[PDB]
Design an enzyme around this catalytic site. Structure first.
Site, PDB file in Angstrom:
ATOM      1  N   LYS A  44       0.816  -1.218   0.000  1.00  0.00           N
ATOM      2  CA  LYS A  44       0.000   0.000   0.000  1.00  0.00           C
ATOM      3  C   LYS A  44       0.847   1.263   0.000  1.00  0.00           C
ATOM      4  O   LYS A  44       0.693   2.161   0.836  1.00  0.00           O
ATOM      5  CB  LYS A  44      -1.020  -0.042   1.129  1.00  0.00           C
ATOM      6  CG  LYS A  44      -2.112  -1.060   0.776  1.00  0.00           C
ATOM      7  CD  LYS A  44      -3.247  -1.075   1.728  1.00  0.00           C
ATOM      8  CE  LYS A  44      -4.156  -2.210   1.410  1.00  0.00           C
ATOM      9  NZ  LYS A  44      -3.463  -3.523   1.569  1.00  0.00           N
ATOM     10  N   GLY A  66     -18.436 -15.597  -5.782  1.00  0.00           N
ATOM     11  CA  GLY A  66     -19.039 -15.572  -7.105  1.00  0.00           C
ATOM     12  C   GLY A  66     -19.471 -14.192  -7.577  1.00  0.00           C
ATOM     13  O   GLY A  66     -19.240 -13.815  -8.721  1.00  0.00           O
TER      14      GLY A  66
HETATM   15  O1  LIG Z   1      -9.448  -2.683   0.524  1.00  0.00           O
HETATM   16  C1  LIG Z   1      -8.653  -3.558   0.870  1.00  0.00           C
HETATM   17  C2  LIG Z   1      -7.366  -3.667   0.314  1.00  0.00           C
HETATM   18  C3  LIG Z   1      -6.565  -4.694   0.752  1.00  0.00           C
HETATM   19  O2  LIG Z   1      -5.350  -4.852   0.226  1.00  0.00           O
HETATM   20  N1  LIG Z   1      -6.982  -5.588   1.714  1.00  0.00           N
HETATM   21  C4  LIG Z   1      -6.065  -6.678   2.117  1.00  0.00           C
HETATM   22  O3  LIG Z   1      -6.627  -7.894   1.669  1.00  0.00           O
HETATM   23  C5  LIG Z   1      -6.502  -8.910   2.684  1.00  0.00           C
HETATM   24  C6  LIG Z   1      -7.863  -9.353   3.130  1.00  0.00           C
HETATM   25  O4  LIG Z   1      -7.737 -10.465   3.997  1.00  0.00           O
HETATM   26  P1  LIG Z   1      -9.003 -11.210   4.579  1.00  0.00           P
HETATM   27  O5  LIG Z   1      -9.556 -12.187   3.461  1.00  0.00           O
HETATM   28  O6  LIG Z   1      -8.390 -12.021   5.803  1.00  0.00           O
HETATM   29  O7  LIG Z   1     -10.023 -10.224   4.994  1.00  0.00           O
HETATM   30  C7  LIG Z   1      -5.632  -8.321   3.781  1.00  0.00           C
HETATM   31  O8  LIG Z   1      -4.257  -8.623   3.514  1.00  0.00           O
HETATM   32  C8  LIG Z   1      -5.854  -6.822   3.636  1.00  0.00           C
HETATM   33  O9  LIG Z   1      -4.768  -6.040   4.095  1.00  0.00           O
HETATM   34  C9  LIG Z   1      -8.236  -5.467   2.214  1.00  0.00           C
HETATM   35  O10 LIG Z   1      -8.666  -6.250   3.046  1.00  0.00           O
HETATM   36  N2  LIG Z   1      -9.044  -4.466   1.790  1.00  0.00           N
END
Ligand SMILES: O=c1cc(O)n([C@@H]2O[C@H](COP(=O)(O)O)[C@@H](O)[C@H]2O)c(=O)[nH]1
Ligand SMILES: O=c1cc(O)n([C@@H]2O[C@H](COP(=O)(O)O)[C@@H](O)[C@H]2O)c(=O)[nH]1
Lengths: 218, 219
Positions: free
Chosen positions: A64, A182
């Site tokens: 990021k 999906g």
């Molecule tokens: O808008 C965003 C952008 C992201 O990179 N992420 C990243 O995507 C991942 C989501 O993980 P999770 O499926 O455990 O919620 C994390 O690594 C988070 O930092 C997110 O959740 N939302």
């Protein structure tokens, strides 16, 4: 980018042993892993090379990136030196900051993913109102890879509209944060899944189940 | 608030351990607070924080511009404080929940959050500038006590100081290489952040001493 099963593992475990074991357990289902700061700051940047050695997977560095251009250049250089195939950059800090990342990526044979709207509730405060403009900025800059939110399919659809069918779009927030695999793949090329897989009792079964649920989409 | 020697914070963005250590050692008599960011950390590891503490006993601000969802922000803060950072810099533009996540970890772990509210580079004008006053006000509402704002825009830095009040702590980058003036910046900021003007100098100690001489009446 050709992502196996349209599924990217977000490997945010913070212990090398667990991260390697869980990734190994799901290796038959994926060939793309997103590695972020939780793992990198706990175990070091050498973890990227180790993932390549063990799995051969492509690695997206989810850092990021959100600094001034000069610092962004240094972050990208360090990241690509470590073996990342791609890096995720925030658009909010503006065009010059994004361009700095694009320059290094071109120099080292890598890709930049532009994060345009985020998936969490706080995204509504400042990011959401800027998101379409950030996406247009991406198009203006020649960005081809984008990230947008599973949790708001109408916003994900708008992002897809802006960038066109030719651009590549990946989307987090699937599972734990409420996004549906999906529905998300109606608009995104690939879904990013973390906790639903890596916190599961049986990560392999968790991955297999998700893939089963989108099998007609593969 | 943290007691920053000479109101001057070194931005140590060299990417080689030997050079980073040499330069920091050379300016040690002038500066007791060092900002370490991702250029150095991604090049040399989080153990670089340990090495700086061992060698210099300087306070460490981890400039990681934390900008993720709350759950990931928490993990980043935990790893950063575990490594020995005194404080971490967090973006406000991802919203209040993301900031609160960092504040909660800092409270639990006995460390500090700095909220970055407007940035100093030209691109900041596109999206960040228009949100900055509200980001700052959000910080005040969340109980944030430490802030970062841009030396390159005195009018903006002044407004940020107004919003956060005189009791809050404000540090400001963009001094030197990016055009900001040390003395003018210190009208509003508690401390200035300086990177290249010091670390790319032939004599970093003389560079630091020179900046300090120029703000002597403000110390
Ligand atoms: O808008 C965003 C952008 C992201 O990179 N992420 C990243 O995507 C991942 C989501 O993980 P999770 O499926 O455990 O919620 C994390 O690594 C988070 O930092 C997110 O959740 N939302
Ligand atoms: O708005 C901001 C916020 C920052 O943290 N920075 C950081 O402050 C430092 C500025 O260094 P320099 O004095 O070399 O321009 C860099 O580490 C940069 O990432 C900045 O320049 N502008």
């Amino acid at each position: 980018m050709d992502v196996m099963n349209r599924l990217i593992l977000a490997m945010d475990l913070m212990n090398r042993d667990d991260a390697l074991r869980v990734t190994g357990e799901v290796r038959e289902y994926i060939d793309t892993v997103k590695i972020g700061y939780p793992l990198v700051l706990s175990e070091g940047m050498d973890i990227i090379a180790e993932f390549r050695k063990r799995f051969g997977c492509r690695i997206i560095a989810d850092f990021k990136v959100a600094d001034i251009p000069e610092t962004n250049e240094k972050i990208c250089r360090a990241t690509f030196k470590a073996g990342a195939d791609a890096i995720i950059v925030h658009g909010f800090p503006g065009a010059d900051s994004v361009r700095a990342c694009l320059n290094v990526a071109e120099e080292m044979g890598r890709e930049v993913f532009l994060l345009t709207e985020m998936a969490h509730p706080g995204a509504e405060m400042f990011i959401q109102g800027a998101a379409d403009e950030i996406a247009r900025m991406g198009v203006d800059l020649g960005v081809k890879n984008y990230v947008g939110p599973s949790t708001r399919p109408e916003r994900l659809s708008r992002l897809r509209e802006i960038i066109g069918q030719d651009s590549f779009l990946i989307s987090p927030g699937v599972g734990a944060q409420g996004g549906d695999p999906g529905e998300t793949l109606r608009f995104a090329d690939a879904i990013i899944v973390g906790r639903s897989i890596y916190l599961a009792d049986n990560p392999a079964a968790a991955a297999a189940g998700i893939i089963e649920s989108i099998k007609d989409l593969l």
